[PDB]
A paper describes a structure:
PFV Gag is a 648 polypeptide and the major FV structural protein in the assembled virion. Here we report the crystal structure an amino terminal domain from the Gag of PFV (PFV-Gag-NtD), provide the molecular details of the interaction of this domain with the N-terminal leader sequence from the PFV Envelope (PFV-Env) and demonstrate that the PFV-Gag-NtD is also the target for Trim5α restriction factors. Our data reveal that the FV Gag is unique and structurally unrelated to the Gag protein of other retroviruses.
This fragment was expressed in E. coli and subsequently the crystal structure determined by SAD methods and refined at a resolution of 2.4 Å. The final Rwork/Rfree are 17.2% and 23.0% respectively. By comparison, our data reveals the PFV-Gag-NtD to be entirely unrelated comprising a mixed α/β protein with head and stalk domains. The coiled-coil contains three regions of leucine zipper at residues Leu143/147, Leu160/161 and Leu171/175. Additionally, a highly synergistic hydrogen-bonding network centred on residue Glu154 is located between two of the zipper regions. Here, the Glu154 sidechain forms hydrogen bonds with the sidechains of Glu154*, Gln150* and Tyr127* of the opposing monomer. In FVs the proposed CTRS constitutes residues 43 to 60 of the PFV-Gag-NtD where residues Leu40 to Arg50 form the loop that links β1 to β2 and the remainder make up the β2 strand.
Numbering used by the authors:
A (entry chain A): 9 to 179
B (entry chain B): 7 to 179
The structure:
């Protein structure tokens, strides 16, 4: 649990033409368009803590990291650079292992899908920061991704060959 | 500096099976393409050096071989491809090299469109990652990430080319 600046959060909401007031217990899916890891999208999931067990507003509100990957259907979503989002979510960082991939957290790479299109592997800055088990999980997941990319590359070659043949036959 | 047993007669059968008539010499280094093994039916690479004699140029009753910590290259001169089980007949306890060395020509992430080694490349399997040290994992992941960056770039290029070709077709109805 880290510190939450709710007035910064509201500015972030308004800048994005989101009118809803953030509520206690709400979960938010974050798309971080860039950060310390580089200029590539990553994902994080947080839960607002605005009140205490007695249902009274906190003087110093907080948020917590949720250990589930952000999904394409994730309802409440915010995109922005790490530096901007940290205005609301103090110390915000990437989640463990392949969770940071969001919709690709389980290696499902889909042709034509915007998220698959935007996916980018972990950088060297990221891997220096990982534990052994994180590295295994990330590596396992990127490997699954590569297997689909490879399969897609083969299909592209066959199709490209066929198209070129069709084009000669019709020229 | 670990050395392992070598069955030269078995090596020579391996060679004859492949129409290679040369006899193995002390100090020769061999590039191995393991077509399949305990990691699965995908190709991996390993490099070894024959030890047939002692420091006094006398033939060993028990020849050995050692692993060379360098990646097999496409130009590697003396090459042998076979499944691990077969190659283990000659090289006792043959196993994959450390981290991305096992990719041979791709050990440094150089993924090239149309290149046969690039086309045959396959990422590490879960059987492989479970065995690896942290630093191995890091190196391998860093390498595979460079590969995917090249694959991503290539996918884009296919999609553009595909588009183009389909238009030219369409306009020929």
């Amino acid at each position: 649990e880290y510190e939450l600046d709710v007035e910064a959060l509201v500015v972030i909401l308004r800048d994005r033409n989101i009118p809803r007031n953030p509520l206690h217990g709400e979960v938010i899916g974050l798309r971080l368009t860039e950060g310390w890891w580089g200029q590539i999208e990553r994902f994080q999931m947080v839960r607002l803590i605005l009140q205490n067990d007695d249902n009274e507003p906190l003087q110093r509100p907080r948020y917590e990291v949720i250990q589930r990957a952000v999904n394409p259907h994730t309802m409440f979503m915010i995109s922005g650079p790490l530096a901007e989002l940290q205005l609301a979510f103090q110390d915000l960082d990437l989640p463990e292992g392949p969770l940071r991939f969001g919709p690709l957290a389980n290696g499902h790479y889909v042709q034509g899908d915007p998220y698959s299109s935007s996916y980018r592997p972990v950088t060297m800055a990221e891997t220096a920061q990982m534990t052994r088990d994180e590295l295994e999980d990330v590596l396992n997941t990127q490997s699954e991704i590569e297997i689909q990319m490879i399969n897609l590359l083969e299909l592209y070659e066959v199709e490209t060959r066929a198209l070129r043949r069709q084009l000669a036959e019709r020229s």
